[PDB]
């Protein structure tokens, strides 16, 4: 409720490029959301970001053993932990579910939104394409983009603006690294 | 850049709340329950392939707390400014009457990392099967959080995610009902 608040954060960050070929380690310290001191592996010592960080930058850079340890973190920490998690994070692949429905119950020759909802997948890279009688439709496509569910799955809704005619079949085609070949779901116009 | 792992920690006074978690590309690998002193895997399967000694976390949090009390005094007792959350409700999957589904309440871009979340069905608190994430870090040093409610879709029910935070003048409801 009433009383005032003080917040410390620390972030120990590991940035990976081309596997573990390049790694950048950042030790970051925050008071509220104000970053006040950090160690950057590309710099090799602590620097005050703000006035409040100079004491810790001077106390910590004088520690030869601390500095040697922080300079080896790309190895003992970043590459190490990447190695530990690799099989269930980096290589995690979870199979998409694909559902197609019209946004609205409409009669034919009214405009509708055909929704291709793609759910439960990992990783995030996905391709969702729309076809009209098996010709790709490139205009009138409306995507949410990636939604992170917070449980190591994504969803995305990719919608097609159209005026369905009698007979017409629309297809949503999904490509994802969990798939050996595209998933396709059909909607036949009422 | 291909991937990012962040060990994110906070300590908050005078609430005496601390968190320790790992984040891989925006998802939680694990956090440490400070109270039970135990490693909590985001998915069960993770704890089969990897371990974490929870004690290391308690130790980090003790130092974070000492460091906060230094910084507090060094700041001349400059308090945090409250940033109220954005709240979004969506389903796990497309909704079908009598097909089990999950409502997700995504609480975003807020600080401090303190929030009360209540699921309301027809204006009334429900908790059967609910769950929630710890506070997840953002690149702008604000927080994110997910709450979950399993539900049976029905034409008779409406739902609200009710969020209380110190930066909101009043509690915020985000609405969902079957169309």
């Amino acid at each position: 409720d009433t009383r005032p608040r003080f917040l410390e954060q620390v972030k120990h960050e590991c940035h990976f490029f081309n596997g573990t070929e390049r790694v950048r380690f950042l030790d970051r310290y925050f008071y509220h959301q104000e970053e006040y001191v950090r160690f950057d592996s590309d710099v090799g010592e602590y620097r005050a970001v703000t006035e409040l960080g100079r004491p810790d930058a001077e106390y910590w850079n004088s520690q030869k053993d601390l500095l040697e340890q922080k300079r080896a973190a790309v190895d003992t920490y970043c590459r190490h932990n990447y190695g530990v998690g690799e099989s269930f994070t980096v290589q995690r692949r979870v199979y998409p579910e694909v559902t197609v429905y019209p946004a609205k119950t409409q009669p034919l020759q009214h405009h509708n939104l055909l929704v291709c909802s793609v759910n439960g997948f990992y990783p995030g890279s996905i391709e969702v394409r729309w076809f009209r009688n098996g010709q790709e439709e490139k205009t009138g496509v409306v995507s949410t983009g990636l939604i992170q569910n917070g449980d190591w799955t994504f969803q995305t809704l990719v919608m097609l603006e159209t005026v369905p005619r009698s007979g017409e079949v629309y297809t949503c085609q999904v490509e994802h690294p969990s798939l050996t070949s595209p998933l396709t779901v059909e909607w036949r116009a009422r | 850049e291909e991937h990012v792992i962040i060990q994110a920690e906070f300590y908050l006074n005078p609430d005496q709340s601390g968190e320790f978690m790992f984040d891989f590309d925006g998802d939680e690998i694990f956090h440490v329950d400070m109270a039970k002193k135990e490693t909590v895997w985001r998915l069960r399967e993770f704890g089969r392939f990897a371990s974490f000694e929870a004690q290391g976390a308690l130790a980090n949090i003790a130092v974070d707390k000492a460091n906060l009390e230094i910084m507090t005094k060094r700041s001349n007792y400059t308090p945090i400014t409250n940033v109220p959350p954005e709240v979004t409700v969506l389903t796990n999957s497309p909704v079908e009457l009598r097909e089990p589904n999950v409502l997700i309440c995504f609480i975003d871009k807020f600080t401090p990392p303190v929030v009360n979340v209540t699921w309301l069905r027809n204006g009334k608190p429900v908790t059967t099967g609910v769950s929630e994430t710890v506070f997840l870090p953002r690149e702008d040093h604000l927080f994110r959080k997910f709450h979950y409610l399993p539900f049976l879709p029905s034409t008779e029910d409406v739902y609200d995610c009710r969020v209380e935070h110190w930066g909101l003048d009043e509690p915020l409801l985000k609405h969902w009902e079957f169309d």
């Binding site: 932990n81 | 060990q7 990897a50 371990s51 290391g56």
Partner: peptide, 15 residues
């Protein structure tokens, strides 16, 4: 598990 994550420690603050 196969292997233990390493927790990166932090230095104590200039008091």
């Amino acid at each position: 598990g196969i292997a233990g994550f390493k927790g990166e420690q932090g230095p104590k603050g200039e008091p």
